[PDB]
């Protein structure tokens, strides 16, 4: 996704099983205005990953992308 235009719909579901945080490069929010907040994880090939940032375990995933 070169632009955020591709990502219009908000994730209302979770991935089958937890994704590898080590293959995650960066993260981004859906739209915010969505019924429920959600953050998409960017894999090596920019696959569509949906995880709820309100979860403590998910926050750790986002954290690894933020701090050093």
């Amino acid at each position: 996704s070169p632009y955020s235009s591709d990502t219009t719909s908000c994730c209302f579901a979770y991935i089958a099983r937890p994704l590898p945080r080590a293959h995650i490069k960066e993260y981004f929010y859906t739209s915010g205005k969505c019924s429920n907040p959600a953050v998409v994880f960017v894999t090596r090939k920019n696959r569509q990953v949906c995880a709820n940032p309100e979860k403590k375990w998910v926050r750790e995933y986002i954290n690894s992308l933020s701090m050093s």
Partner: peptide
């Protein structure tokens, strides 16, 4: 033999988890 593989490439299994989610169900 029995085969149950449909080639997992994320787009399928990984991102097709929906009927297994509790969408407003009282259990």
């Amino acid at each position: 033999m029995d085969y149950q593989v449909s080639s997992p490439i994320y787009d399928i299994n990984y991102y097709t988890s929906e009927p297994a989610q509790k969408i407003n169900v009282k259990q």
